[PDB]
Design a protein around this ligand. Structure first.
Ligand code: CLA
Ligand code: CLA
Ligand code: CLA
Ligand code: CLA
Ligand SMILES: CCCCCCCCCCCCCCCC(=O)OC[C@H](COP(=O)(O)OC[C@@H](O)CO)OC(=O)CCCCCCCCCCCCCCC
Ligand SMILES: CC1=C(/C=C/C(C)=C/C=C/C(C)=C/C=C/C=C(C)/C=C/C=C(C)/C=C/C2=C(C)CCCC2(C)C)C(C)(C)CCC1
Ligand SMILES: CC1=C(/C=C/C(C)=C/C=C/C(C)=C/C=C/C=C(C)/C=C/C=C(C)/C=C/C2=C(C)CCCC2(C)C)C(C)(C)CCC1
Lengths: 122, 51
C-alpha cells in the first residue's frame, strides 16, 4: 500500500522493486502517433553467476554460482528515459538518468572475490 | 640410576600414570592429524581433479 520511510527502514525492502498482482496479465496499447517514457525503471538482481576459467585442456567453462557479500545494496532504480515508437513499430527505450549502477562483490568457491559494476548505463 | 633407554619403565606398576602417558600419546596423535590436515588444506589446489 502507501507505506512510508519509517515503515520500511532497516527491513531490506528498500532494495526490492515493486511488484504486480498474479492477475495483472493485461496489455498496454501503443498509440504510434504518441510519445512515451519510462517514468521509473527498477532492476533487482537475484542471482550472480561467474564464468569459470577452464584449464588449458578446457572442454567448456560454465557459469558457477556465487555468494553475495555486500548486502542489500545491489538494485538499480529510479531510471528514466524515453520510450520511442520506431517506424517498423518496435519500441526502443533510451536511458537518460537514474541510479543506474551498483558496485557488487560476490565470492566464488575457494574464496576468490569478484567485484563488478552492475550497471545499465546508457 | 636408570639408563636413558629405560626411563619409561616407571609406568609398569603405576596404572594411572600409564593411563596418563597413553592419553598424552593419543593427544599427540590426534594433534598431528589436525595439523597435517590444515597444512594440506593450506596447500591443496582443488581447481583440476583431472590433471
Ligand atoms: C609420547 C611421548 C612421551 C611421553 C608421554 C613421555 C612420558 C614420560 N617421560 Mg619420556 N621421553 C620422550 C617422550 C615421551 N615421554 C622422548 C621423545 C624422549 C627423548 C627426549 C623422552 C625422554 C625422557 C627422559 C629423559 C625422562 C622421561 C621421563 C618421563 C616421565 C615424566 C615426564 C618427564 O620428565 O618428561 C621429560 C620428557 C620431555 C620433556 C619430552 C621433551 C620432548 C619435546 C616435547 C620434543 C619437542 C621438540 C621440539 C619442540 C621440536 C619442534 C619442531 C621443530 C621443527 C622446531 C613420563 C613417564 C622422565 C622419567 O620419569 O624418568 C624416569 C625422564 O627422566 N622421558
Ligand atoms: C607400542 C610400542 C611400544 C611400547 C609401548 C614400548 C615400551 C617400552 N619399550 Mg619397546 N620397543 C618397541 C615398541 C614399544 N616399546 C619397538 C617397535 C622396538 C623396536 C625398535 C622396541 C625396542 C625396545 C628396546 C630395545 C628396549 C625397549 C624398552 C622399552 C621400555 C623402556 C623404553 C624407554 O624408556 O624408552 C626411552 C627412549 C628414549 C628416551 C628416546 C628414544 C628416541 C628414539 C630412538 C627416537 C624417537 C622417535 C620419535 C619419538 C617418534 C616416535 C616413533 C614413531 C614410531 C611414531 C618400555 C616398556 C627398553 C627395555 O626393555 O627396558 C626394560 C629397551 O631396552 N623397547
Ligand atoms: C567400563 C569399561 C571400559 C571401557 C568402556 C574402557 C574404554 C577404554 N579403555 Mg579400558 N579399562 C577398563 C574398563 C573400560 N575401558 C577397566 C575395568 C580397566 C582396568 C582398571 C581398564 C584399563 C584401561 C587402561 C589401563 C587403558 C584403557 C584404555 C581405554 C581406552 C582405549 C581407547 C582410547 O583411548 O580411545 C581414544 C579415546 C577417545 C576417542 C576418547 C573417548 C572418550 C571416552 C568417551 C571417555 C570420556 C570420559 C570418561 C568418563 C572416561 C572413563 C571412560 C572409561 C575408559 C572408564 C578406551 C576408552 C587406555 C586409555 O585410557 O587410553 C588412553 C589405557 O591405557 N583401559
Ligand atoms: C600404530 C601406530 C603407532 C605406534 C604403535 C606408536 C608407538 C610408539 N610411539 Mg607413537 N606416534 C604415532 C603412531 C604410533 N606410535 C603417530 C601416528 C604419531 C604422530 C606422528 C606418533 C607420535 C609419537 C610421538 C611424538 C612419540 C611417540 C612415541 C611412541 C612410543 C612410546 C613408547 C616408548 O617409550 O617407546 C620406546 C621407544 C622405542 C621403542 C623406539 C622405537 C622406534 C620407532 C620404531 C621409530 C624408529 C626410529 C625412528 C624412525 C628414527 C627417527 C629419526 C628422525 C628423527 C630423523 C611407541 C613406540 C614416543 C616415543 O618414542 O617416546 C620415546 C614419542 O615421543 N609417538
Ligand atoms: C620427538 C623427537 C625427540 C627425539 C629424541 C632424540 C633421540 C634421543 C637420544 C638418542 C641418542 C642415543 C645415543 C646413546 C648412546 C650411548 O649412550 O651409548 C652408551 C650406552 C651405555 O649404557 P650402559 O648400559 O652402560 O648405561 C650407562 C647409562 O649412563 C646410560 O644412560 O649404551 C647404550 O645406550 C646402548 C646403545 C649403544 C648405542 C651405540 C652407539 C655407539 C655408536 C658409536 C659409533 C658411531 C659411528 C662411528 C663409526 C663409523
Ligand atoms: C590445549 C587445549 C586446546 C588446544 C589444543 C591444541 C592447540 C592442540 C595442538 C596439538 C597439535 C598441534 C599437535 C600436533 C602434534 C604433532 C606431532 C606430535 C608430530 C609428530 C612428529 C613426528 C613424530 C615426526 C617424526 C619424523 C620426523 C620429524 C622426520 C621424518 C621421520 C619421522 C616421521 C620419524 C583446546 C582449546 C582444544 C581445548 C583446551 C585445551
Ligand atoms: C586452564 C587454564 C589455562 C590452560 C592452558 C593450557 C591447557 C594451554 C595448553 C597449551 C598447549 C597444549 C600447547 C600446545 C602447543 C603445541 C605446539 C607448540 C605444537 C606445535 C606443532 C607443530 C610444530 C606441528 C607441525 C606440523 C605438523 C606436525 C604436521 C603438519 C605440518 C606442520 C609442520 C605444521 C590457561 C593457562 C590458559 C590459564 C587459564 C586457566
Amino acid at each position: 500500500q502507501t507505506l512510508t520511510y519509517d515503515d520500511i527502514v532497516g527491513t531490506g525492502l528498500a532494495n526490492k522493486c515493486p511488484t504486480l498482482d498474479d492477475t495483472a496479465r493485461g496489455a498496454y496499447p501503443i498509440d504510434s502517433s504518441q510519445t512515451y517514457r519510462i517514468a521509473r525503471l527498477c532492476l533487482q538482481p537475484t542471482t550472480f553467476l561467474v564464468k569459470e576459467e577452464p584449464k588449458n585442456k578446457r572442454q567448456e567453462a560454465e557459469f558457477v554460482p556465487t555468494k553475495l557479500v555486500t548486502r542489500e545494496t545491489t538494485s538499480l532504480d529510479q531510471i528514466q528515459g524515453e520510450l520511442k515508437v520506431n517506424s517498423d513499430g518496435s519500441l526502443t527505450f533510451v536511458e537518460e538518468d537514474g541510479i543506474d549502477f551498483q558496485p557488487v562483490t560476490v565470492q566464488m568457491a575457494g574464496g576468490e572475490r569478484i567485484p563488478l559494476l552492475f550497471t545499465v548505463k546508457n | 640410576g636408570l639408563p636413558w633407554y629405560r626411563v619409561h619403565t616407571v609406568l609398569i606398576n603405576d596404572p594411572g600414570r600409564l593411563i596418563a602417558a597413553h592419553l598424552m600419546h593419543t593427544a599427540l596423535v590426534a594433534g598431528w592429524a589436525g595439523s597435517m590436515a590444515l597444512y594440506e588444506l593450506a596447500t591443496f589446489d582443488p581447481s583440476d581433479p583431472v590433471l
